[PDB]
Amino acid sequence: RAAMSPGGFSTGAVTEENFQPKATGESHRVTRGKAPKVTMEKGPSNLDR
Amino acid sequence: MKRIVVPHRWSEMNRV
């Protein structure tokens, strides 16, 4: 969650090509499984190389 | 005395 978190409050210019639709399709009261996260990629050691 | 016109787009200049 720390890799995808924007630092502080962040806003940009608005354009109708980028909409950000709020119609998600599930309940808004639950927040389990909704955070942006990277897929963890662990590099190989020199034994694996 | 400044005449105000709209700048033409490329679809307006090269309209066929």
Partner: protein, 277 residues
């Protein structure tokens, strides 16, 4: 007389006004030389004798008339005489005021950092130039209108957008065109970038370009292009109206052409009081 002052410096005799030497009377340059007392003794003209280099004596008295002091860059001996004579006489402290920080002043140098974001998939490109200036005062609305006029003749606006995001930052994109067309856009942007800064009174001193490798799972690059300018210049038209954030034109127009402009009624119309030909 109170009008003419004759100072013999190094054999050369120069003529000056009493208001020139006593422009800064609190300095030791003026209070050590009694100009009104020498005018009552010598009725024709005041006569004083100074021991300086005569070319440096033109530099200090020429500063009192033009209010600008220019020092020689090559000749370091004459350069050392101005910093010594005006310090001993007290004219140096009044020449360069130290200020402590509405008008806006342009800086001496100017750097422009351009951060591109490239995407390439088999012979096409996709650019996102983030133009960023170094300080306030640069009219980027005049910069973007230089970009929008020259790029509308080459390519349609359905492939690129350009708008202002800050006072010292601009933006420009390119939506998946070929390599011959994308390099046409990027070179035309960076030429209007420097030509806007040449019109502000600067000159391009140095520049460099930086290309970054791909991200580890996508074909995304980061092309960094940096410039550096310097202060070279020593300091009823036609309104072309455009919004800042542009709107896209996809498909047919939803509103007709006559619904854009506003017209007054015919009964409210008056005759023109200025001539029109």
């Amino acid at each position: 007389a109170s009008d003419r002052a004759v100072i013999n410096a190094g054999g050369r005799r120069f003529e000056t006004l009493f208001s020139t030497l006593h422009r800064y009377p609190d300095t030791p340059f003026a209070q050590l030389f009694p100009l009104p007392g020498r005018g009552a003794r010598q009725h024709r003209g005041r006569e004083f004798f100074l021991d300086v280099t005569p070319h440096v004596f033109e530099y200090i008295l020429g500063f009192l008339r033009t209010n600008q002091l220019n020092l020689p860059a090559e000749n370091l001996q004459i350069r050392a005489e101005v910093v010594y004579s005006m310090n001993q006489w007290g004219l140096l402290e009044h020449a360069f005021p130290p200020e402590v920080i509405a008008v806006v002043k342009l800086p001496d140098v100017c750097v422009v950092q351009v951060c591109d974001h490239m995407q390439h998939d088999q012979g096409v490109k996709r650019h996102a130039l983030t133009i960023t200036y170094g300080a306030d005062g640069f009219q980027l609305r005049s910069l973007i209108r230089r970009v929008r006029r020259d790029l509308e003749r080459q390519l349609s606006s359905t492939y690129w957008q350009c708008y202002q995001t800050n006072e010292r930052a601009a933006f420009f994109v390119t939506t998946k065109v070929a390599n011959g067309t994308a390099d046409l856009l990027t070179t035309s942007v960076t030429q209007q970038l420097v030509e806007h800064t040449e019109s502000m009174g600067y000159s391009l001193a140095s520049s460099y370009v930086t290309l970054s490798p791909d991200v580890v799972h996508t074909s995304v690059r980061m092309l960094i292009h940096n410039f550096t300018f310097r202060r070279s210049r020593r300091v009823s038209e036609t309104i072309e109206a455009e919004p800042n954030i542009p709107t896209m034109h996809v498909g047919p127009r939803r509103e007709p052409l006559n619904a854009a402009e506003s017209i007054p009624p015919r009964n409210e119309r008056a005759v023109n009081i200025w001539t029109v030909d």
